[PDB]
Amino acid sequence: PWVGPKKGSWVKILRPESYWFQQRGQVVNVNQKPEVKYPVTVKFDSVNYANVNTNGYALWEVIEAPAPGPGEV
Amino acid sequence: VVAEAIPRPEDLLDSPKFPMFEGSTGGYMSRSTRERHAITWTAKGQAKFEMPTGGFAIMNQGENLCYFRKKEQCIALGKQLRKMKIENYKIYRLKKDGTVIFMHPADGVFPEKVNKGRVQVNGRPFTIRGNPQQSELKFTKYQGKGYEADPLTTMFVKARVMAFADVPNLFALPQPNMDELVPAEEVDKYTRQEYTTRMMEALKRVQDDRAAKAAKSL
Amino acid sequence: XXXXXXXXXXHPKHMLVAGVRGYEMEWQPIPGDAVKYPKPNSEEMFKTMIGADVETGGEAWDPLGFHKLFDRNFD
Amino acid sequence: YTETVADERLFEQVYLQYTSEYLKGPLYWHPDKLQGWLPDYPGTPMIKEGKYTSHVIGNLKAFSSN
Amino acid sequence: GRCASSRYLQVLGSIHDIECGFGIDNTLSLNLQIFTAHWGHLTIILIWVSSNLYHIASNANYSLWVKNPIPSMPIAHNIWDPHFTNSTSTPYSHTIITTILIAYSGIYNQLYTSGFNTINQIYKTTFTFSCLAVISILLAKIHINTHSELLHKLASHTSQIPSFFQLLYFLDVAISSVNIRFNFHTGILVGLFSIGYTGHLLDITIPASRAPLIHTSPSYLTFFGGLKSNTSSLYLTDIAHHHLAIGIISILTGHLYSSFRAALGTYIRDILYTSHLTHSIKSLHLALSLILASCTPLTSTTAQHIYSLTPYFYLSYDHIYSTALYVHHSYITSFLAIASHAHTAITLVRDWVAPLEQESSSKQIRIHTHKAAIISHLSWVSLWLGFHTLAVYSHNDTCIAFNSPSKQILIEASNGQLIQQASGKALYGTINSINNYNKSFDSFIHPISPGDLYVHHAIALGLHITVLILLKGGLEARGSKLMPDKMEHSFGFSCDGPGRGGTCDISAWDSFYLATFWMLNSNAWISFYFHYKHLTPRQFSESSTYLESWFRDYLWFNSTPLIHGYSTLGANDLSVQSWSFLLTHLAWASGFMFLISWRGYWQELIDIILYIHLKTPILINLWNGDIYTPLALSIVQARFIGLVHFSTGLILTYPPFIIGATS
Amino acid sequence: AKPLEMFGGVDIDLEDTPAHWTIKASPVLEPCKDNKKFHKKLKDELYKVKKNQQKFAEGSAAYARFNKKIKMIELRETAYGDRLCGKKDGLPRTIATGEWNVRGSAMWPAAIFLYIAGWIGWAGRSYLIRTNDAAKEINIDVPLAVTCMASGFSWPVAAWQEIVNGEMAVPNDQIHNGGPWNQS
Amino acid sequence: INGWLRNLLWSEASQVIQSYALSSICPYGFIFLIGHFIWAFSLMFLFSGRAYWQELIESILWSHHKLKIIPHIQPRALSISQGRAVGFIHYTLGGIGSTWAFIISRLLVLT
Numbered sequence A: 001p002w003v004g005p006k007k008g009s010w011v012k013i014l015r016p017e018s019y020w021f022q023q024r025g026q027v028v029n030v031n032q033k034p035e036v037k038y039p040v041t042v043k044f045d046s047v048n049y050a051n052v053n054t055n056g057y058a059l060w061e062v063i064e065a066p067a068p069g070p071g072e073v
Numbered sequence B: 001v002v003a004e005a006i007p008r009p010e011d012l013l014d015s016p017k018f019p020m021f022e023g024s025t026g027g028y029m030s031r032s033t034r035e036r037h038a039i040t041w042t043a044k045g046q047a048k049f050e051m052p053t054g055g056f057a058i059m060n061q062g063e064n065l066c067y068f069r070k071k072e073q074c075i076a077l078g079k080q081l082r083k084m085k086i087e088n089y090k091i092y093r094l095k096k097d098g099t100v101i102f103m104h105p106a107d108g109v110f111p112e113k114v115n116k117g118r119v120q121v122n123g124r125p126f127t128i129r130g131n132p133q134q135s136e137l138k139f140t141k142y143q144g145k146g147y148e149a150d151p152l153t154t155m156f157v158k159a160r161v162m163a164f165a166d167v168p169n170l171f172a173l174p175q176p177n178m179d180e181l182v183p184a185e186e187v188d189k190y191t192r193q194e195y196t197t198r199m200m201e202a203l204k205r206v207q208d209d210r211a212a213k214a215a216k217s218l
Numbered sequence C: 001x002x003x004x005x006x007x008x009x010x011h012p013k014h015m016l017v018a019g020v021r022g023y024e025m026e027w028q029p030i031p032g033d034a035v036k037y038p039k040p041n042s043e044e045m046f047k048t049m050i051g052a053d054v055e056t057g058g059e060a061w062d063p064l065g066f067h068k069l070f071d072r073n074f075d
Numbered sequence D: 001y002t003e004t005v006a007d008e009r010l011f012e013q014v015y016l017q018y019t020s021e022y023l024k025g026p027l028y029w030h031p032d033k034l035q036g037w038l039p040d041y042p043g044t045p046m047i048k049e050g051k052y053t054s055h056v057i058g059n060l061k062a063f064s065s066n
Numbered sequence E: 001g002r003c004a005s006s007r008y009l010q011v012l013g014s015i016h017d018i019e020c021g022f023g024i025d026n027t028l029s030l031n032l033q034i035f036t037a038h039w040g041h042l043t044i045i046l047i048w049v050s051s052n053l054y055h056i057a058s059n060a061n062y063s064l065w066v067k068n069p070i071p072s073m074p075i076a077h078n079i080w081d082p083h084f085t086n087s088t089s090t091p092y093s094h095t096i097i098t099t100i101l102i103a104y105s106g107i108y109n110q111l112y113t114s115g116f117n118t119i120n121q122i123y124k125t126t127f128t129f130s131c132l133a134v135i136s137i138l139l140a141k142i143h144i145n146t147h148s149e150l151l152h153k154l155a156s157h158t159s160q161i162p163s164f165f166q167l168l169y170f171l172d173v174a175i176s177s178v179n180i181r182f183n184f185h186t187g188i189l190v191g192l193f194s195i196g197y198t199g200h201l202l203d204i205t206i207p208a209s210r211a212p213l214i215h216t217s218p219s220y221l222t223f224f225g226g227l228k229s230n231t232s233s234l235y236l237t238d239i240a241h242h243h244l245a246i247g248i249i250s251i252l253t254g255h256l257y258s259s260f261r262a263a264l265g266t267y268i269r270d271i272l273y274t275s276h277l278t279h280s281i282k283s284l285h286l287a288l289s290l291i292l293a294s295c296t297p298l299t300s301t302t303a304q305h306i307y308s309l310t311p312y313f314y315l316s317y318d319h320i321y322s323t324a325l326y327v328h329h330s331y332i333t334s335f336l337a338i339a340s341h342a343h344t345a346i347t348l349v350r351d352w353v354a355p356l357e358q359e360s361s362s363k364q365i366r367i368h369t370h371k372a373a374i375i376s377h378l379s380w381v382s383l384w385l386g387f388h389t390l391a392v393y394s395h396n397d398t399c400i401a402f403n404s405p406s407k408q409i410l411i412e413a414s415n416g417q418l419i420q421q422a423s424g425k426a427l428y429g430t431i432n433s434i435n436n437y438n439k440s441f442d443s444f445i446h447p448i449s450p451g452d453l454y455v456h457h458a459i460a461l462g463l464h465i466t467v468l469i470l471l472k473g474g475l476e477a478r479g480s481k482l483m484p485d486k487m488e489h490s491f492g493f494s495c496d497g498p499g500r501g502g503t504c505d506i507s508a509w510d511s512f513y514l515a516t517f518w519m520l521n522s523n524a525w526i527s528f529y530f531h532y533k534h535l536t537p538r539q540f541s542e543s544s545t546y547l548e549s550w551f552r553d554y555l556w557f558n559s560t561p562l563i564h565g566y567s568t569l570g571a572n573d574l575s576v577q578s579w580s581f582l583l584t585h586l587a588w589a590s591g592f593m594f595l596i597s598w599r600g601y602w603q604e605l606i607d608i609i610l611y612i613h614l615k616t617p618i619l620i621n622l623w624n625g626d627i628y629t630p631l632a633l634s635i636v637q638a639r640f641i642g643l644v645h646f647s648t649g650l651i652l653t654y655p656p657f658i659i660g661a662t663s
Numbered sequence F: 001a002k003p004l005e006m007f008g009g010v011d012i013d014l015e016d017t018p019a020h021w022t023i024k025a026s027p028v029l030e031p032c033k034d035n036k037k038f039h040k041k042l043k044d045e046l047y048k049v050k051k052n053q054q055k056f057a058e059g060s061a062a063y064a065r066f067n068k069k070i071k072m073i074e075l076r077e078t079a080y081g082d083r084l085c086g087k088k089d090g091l092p093r094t095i096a097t098g099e100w101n102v103r104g105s106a107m108w109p110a111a112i113f114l115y116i117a118g119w120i121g122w123a124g125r126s127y128l129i130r131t132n133d134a135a136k137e138i139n140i141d142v143p144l145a146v147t148c149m150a151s152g153f154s155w156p157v158a159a160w161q162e163i164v165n166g167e168m169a170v171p172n173d174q175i176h177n178g179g180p181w182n183q184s
Numbered sequence G: 001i002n003g004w005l006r007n008l009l010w011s012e013a014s015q016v017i018q019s020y021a022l023s024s025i026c027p028y029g030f031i032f033l034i035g036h037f038i039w040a041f042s043l044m045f046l047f048s049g050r051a052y053w054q055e056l057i058e059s060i061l062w063s064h065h066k067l068k069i070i071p072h073i074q075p076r077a078l079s080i081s082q083g084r085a086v087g088f089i090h091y092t093l094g095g096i097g098s099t100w101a102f103i104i105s106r107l108l109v110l111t
């Protein structure tokens, strides 16, 4: 039984200290081990100050938002 | 792991373990400092390297030994050696008395390689944003150090933050009766377990009085 | 089959906006003014309101879209 | 059984939900719960049901609307 | 292990940060320390007042200035400096007589208006104020003992129940109580102090200004207006009536909160809870911020209205008093204004509890929800004002350099003119309905020209940018996108490292440090505007729309007497002014290196110097550096020291120019 | 009772009629063609330029260029005659009361600039929306760029139609609000 | 030092400061003013760190994202080294321009 958002599905970030808070990014993969605290891996078009466009988030920090659309983060 | 017998640098003049190095003013300042750090390693060929204190050096085909004032210089030289595929280098801190403390490959395995028996020191079980607010821990153990709070205290203050926003359902603390309480401390009735029962009944009386007073014009 | 996330590991989302009470509270009791929780319906109820006539079209005549600004307040 | 991160999060939620209700009661006694602090004065509730209670208008609370 | 040379700077950077004290464990200790410090500060103020009164009494000429105030000049104090010429005579003395300094404070007019006539009265006043300083220190001791006695009475204190620990929160109810403090401040300290000063005026000031009159009858309360013709100041009867009205109003207002009895007055907490506030009133930083934000309009209006409506005898007749007072109070109120924002930021860092993420209940919460909108719009208005003021000034400069004064863009200041016209119509309607008309209001309404419009836009730009920096620092003190953990660190800290793009000047204290430059610049603009309009209203009205006029006809032109002060031709009584001018230039430039050059360079330099000292023959056998190790100043200390040098230079370079230009 | 001396030099209208709300009724200002300072300033301009002109040869090109400059100065003098200037400076003023019908009014430049500035901003926003990529910002798609630049003329209508139809703004819950200020 | 201030930077600056509408030396007075402006402008880069400007840029970028104006070349404040370089360049350029105008206008007037 798959857990978390599907691969390639857009999710809105709910981590307040994240550089992409309330932004959206494609789900690269979700780790299926229940022991992993932050299994969801999300990649973004906008890099942060460390020039990193991907990060691993918790299961409770992604809400499966729709596609961004024209001129929308 | 067995610590070596690194002698004090002021007592090991002219040792065969010393690499051929040019020698500069950047070395440890004697006549003012007594704490020295020593790094030893075994090389395979006399490959030239750069001393952390200015000037270049040539290793020995066998054992090597260098003395430095700071652990940072020893670690810099260790990284430089490790770039040359030279493992098995150990870094010691020499106390003023001559006590040898084994520092860098502390358990014999380099810190970037996972080794069993290690425990996460200074670990915090939440995201960095999960730290409690500094304002909440005023005049407590963590007065200006909210990042040092144990996770139980963080959860407790988080629950307090959750609670102290539903203002209408809060309980105002009753005003103490200073004039008629406050006898000499020797004047007490003991019965500690009865004192909590007295707390229960007194708070029940306070709440009933408040409800009766509120149900007059509300 | 996607497993349902338990309420322990669910998400808060951002349905809780500045115009409504937060996690659990009550909003300030303002006297006669904008009260209660607003909901977007201006344009929709504007298309059912009468007043449109054949002088200008025959449907809800509102260039400049002044009706819709209530629905935009949320955006 | 091993304590997964979801189980730890569940304990977090249970602890917070219980304690946030407990601290509102008469058994926590924090300085922020004093009179003049966040909680209303004992016999004078100001706002209830999201409406100004009659005690807001002070000595006029007994006056009729007319 | 022990400390390095940076210990002194570290300690002195928080020498009065009583919250950061190590022995302090509770709000009782903090509040008592603050109360005792207040008593000591009041003692210092009283001693300063007695100082000025003594020096006017002893080393001065009040007895002679009072007779002929218009052409005479007051004396601050004598000059006793062994560095002067033991031969000849200094330019500050009448040949063989002692050396004197001309007072530019304004105390002479204050004492003359208040009713002083003789040196003996000033001497008795000095004695009384020294007595009051003694009284203040003794009150400090009294309150320390009373609170320690309450603490000792906790040796005979128990509630016989586990609720006894509640007394922990009420030990400092004497200091932390708000309703009683508000009631008694607003009533006594404001209203009854005003009423007592009305009594002082009616008993002394008005009797000792005119021929003998009736027994202080109620005819001493007039409603004339301003600028009594002979003394060119407000009517003392008008001042007494004003203080009486303010006193009555504030006495009535002072009965608002529940101070001494629970059956009278409304509580401040209930007032706030049913409004758009309900802030954390137990924070000392919040109270300090919002009362510093109160002394700011008071001091700014003091600066404005000491000049516009001169209240003291012959104050307008002194060309130096009027400018010095205005500039002084403008600088004081600018400092208090930036203080309010600094302590608001400290409040948000230290003494503010916020909901989880979304409970939009606190006012600070609602402000923080849309803080980005606030900062973006403040940036927009700042950019607009800067662009359109600098560009129009550049147009005027270019078109007047090109021999075309008529090609300038001169927007007539129509809105300010409309406000002035309405106020003038109101005042003229007041005057025309008087049997004792032909009154004057001095500079309450002044000629407004396009130069005034441009300078007002520049001042608005400066205020907007200062508020922008301070507000951004306050709102992002608890965390920004760049550093989303800023409330875990101190209010002031060095940086967040070179990584993540580089993070120099990231703390809220760094926002204050950046904003102090803009405060100084805005104050300089305001002071230049006032001083230029004071020196020559006509030339300012015509040629002030192009910045070259400000550069030439004001700075370059009016600096002639000051530089000529001491030269190879003799000295004037402006020699101290010129010497302090150059010294303050040196101080201003000296702080550039603390701001531009940063720590690591100097740390290497200090390591080299320390190498020398540990290498010099005799030093090495006496001092190995292990005790008070010399180190370069830390980053925050460096920024603060550079800021102090810059502020001192910029502020203290101006009074010499004012004195040289006006006197 | 002589408001000039009462208020330290400044004079007040003292009359409440709508006919004085125009800038032309102000006693501070005066039409430039009958102002002494205006005459003196432009006469001094003419005198200085003419004195410079005489310094050169009669038949030189510099003499002709100075004649052209003199003609420009005299044209400027006659063109600013209807413009209002202060009764003490002689420098013509710019009207910022929204008069719309006076010489030197700021309404026409304001309208022109606002139109063209909205045009620039709308063209840039349209290009950014239609090129949702960083590669298109460094290597500009010139045909699309000029298409948006030409299309920007209808900004005052298209922008409003997007504002009311929910296509310009975005809810705050879709963009990064800012740094966290709380959590615990 | 007062001699340098008075007889060099003040008395000998009369030519450049009073150079408006004077045919040859108008640009020198204007460039004197511009050099002062540029020199003072350098201090914004010299005294400030890049973190404040980065946070301000993020605040502005919020308003840009609000109206669907997303610069995909993400706006970042100048790097620390670049901030120092810009400050130094503006400082030296403005000061050199100030001296340049001051000396050249005076020598052109006197000659």
Ligand code: CLA
Binding pocket: E586, E589, E590, E591, E592, E593, E596, E597
């Ligand atoms: C006018 C401002 C000013 C002043 C005075 C200085 C002064 C100094 N700088 Mg400096 N600097 C400045 C601006 C200034 N800087 C700026 C804007 C920058 C740009 C970043 C730098 C960058 C800089 C660097 C990079 C270096 C210096 C260095 C130096 C030192 C070498 C000169 C020296 O030792 O003379 C002595 C100092 C004086 C001020 C001369 C006058 C001394 C007074 C007049 C005599 C004594 C007064 C008397 C005792 C009164 C007693 C005090 C009183 C309380 C009793 C000196 C402390 C160099 C250094 O430290 O190397 C040695 C160095 O490496 N500076």
Ligand code: CLA
Binding pocket: E381, E384, E385, E411, E412, E413, E414, E415, E416, E417, E448, E452, E453, E456, E457, E460, F096, F097, F106, F107, F110, F111, F114
């Ligand atoms: C950010 C914009 C801004 C700010 C902060 C100020 C600030 C100030 N202005 Mg001001 N002004 C502005 C823009 C601004 N102005 C513009 C665009 C004009 C037209 C050229 C004027 C014309 C003007 C005059 C004539 C006078 C002032 C005065 C003043 C001062 C007193 C306050 C007042 O009455 O202003 C009025 C308030 C405003 C102007 C706010 C308007 C803000 C909008 C958004 C600016 C853009 C409007 C836009 C261009 C209109 C286009 C119309 C077009 C569609 C036809 C104060 C310092 C007075 C003064 O200093 O006298 C001593 C005065 O007499 N202003």
Ligand code: CLA
Binding pocket: E376, E377, E379, E380, E383, F120, F121, F122, F123, F124, F125, F127, F128, F140, F144, F145, F146, F148, F149, G059, G060, G061, G063, G064, G067, G069
């Ligand atoms: C598509 C272009 C574009 C658009 C539509 C906007 C729109 C806006 N900007 Mg802005 N900005 C831009 C580019 C743009 N900006 C650039 C390139 C910069 C870097 C200098 C800035 C820097 C900037 C600041 C610092 C601030 C704004 C602010 C604002 C807002 C208020 C209006 C304002 O201040 O304008 C004035 C705009 C400027 C002063 C920047 C210069 C304008 C540039 C040069 C226009 C470039 C357009 C581009 C070349 C078009 C090419 C089209 C082609 C490829 C087809 C508004 C939402 C303010 C804000 O957030 O308040 C709400 C604010 O404080 N902007």
Ligand code: CLA
Binding pocket: E551, E555, E556, G001, G004, G005, G008, G009, G010, G013, G014, G017, G035, G036, G039, G040, G094, G095, G096, G097, G098, G099, G100, G102
């Ligand atoms: C608000 C006031 C103000 C301010 C801030 C400035 C700012 C400036 N002016 Mg300036 N100026 C002003 C008013 C002002 N001016 C007025 C009213 C006049 C009268 C017209 C002038 C006349 C003037 C002239 C004529 C010159 C300046 C220069 C300068 C620049 C100096 C920059 C620098 O690095 O100096 C660094 C300072 C120095 C290197 C020292 C020079 C000044 C001293 C007195 C020389 C004495 C040398 C002596 C032997 C001791 C030297 C010590 C040694 C260790 C360095 C700077 C842009 C100068 C410039 O372009 O650069 C120098 C310049 O040529 N200004």
Ligand SMILES: CC1=C(/C=C/C(C)=C/C=C/C(C)=C/C=C/C=C(C)/C=C/C=C(C)/C=C/C2=C(C)CCCC2(C)C)C(C)(C)CCC1
Binding pocket: E039, E040, E041, E043, E044, E047
């Ligand atoms: C800062 C400070 C403070 C203080 C302040 C003050 C208050 C000061 C003072 C000062 C002073 C106030 C000083 C004084 C001095 C004096 C003197 C020095 C005197 C002497 C005298 C004598 C010696 C006498 C003698 C005699 C006798 C014995 C009797 C008879 C007569 C004769 C004369 C013989 C406080 C506390 C806040 C705290 C912190 C610090």
Ligand SMILES: CC1=C(C/C=C(\C)CCC[C@H](C)CCC[C@H](C)CCCC(C)C)C(=O)c2ccccc2C1=O
Binding pocket: E008, E593, E594, E595, E597, E598, E599, E600, E602, E603, E606, E631, E632, E633, E634, E635, E638
């Ligand atoms: C000049 C300079 C220094 C050097 C200044 C130092 C090291 C301190 C200078 C102190 C002066 C020389 C006075 C020394 C004090 C006296 C010896 C009196 C002692 C008083 C104590 C006993 C309290 C820095 O360390 C520094 C650090 C970071 C950014 C910029 C700079 C910077 O510009």
Ligand SMILES: CC1=C(C/C=C(\C)CCC[C@H](C)CCC[C@H](C)CCCC(C)C)C(=O)c2ccccc2C1=O
Binding pocket: G044, G045, G046, G048, G049, G050, G053, G054, G076, G077, G078, G079, G080, G082, G083, G084
């Ligand atoms: C203001 C400032 C910024 C912000 C300034 C930036 C980002 C400059 C870039 C803005 C544009 C791209 C510059 C382009 C030129 C100007 C728009 C116009 C210059 C020419 C005019 C006269 C026409 C920093 O990033 C910074 C970083 C480190 C230390 C200090 C500072 C610093 O002081």
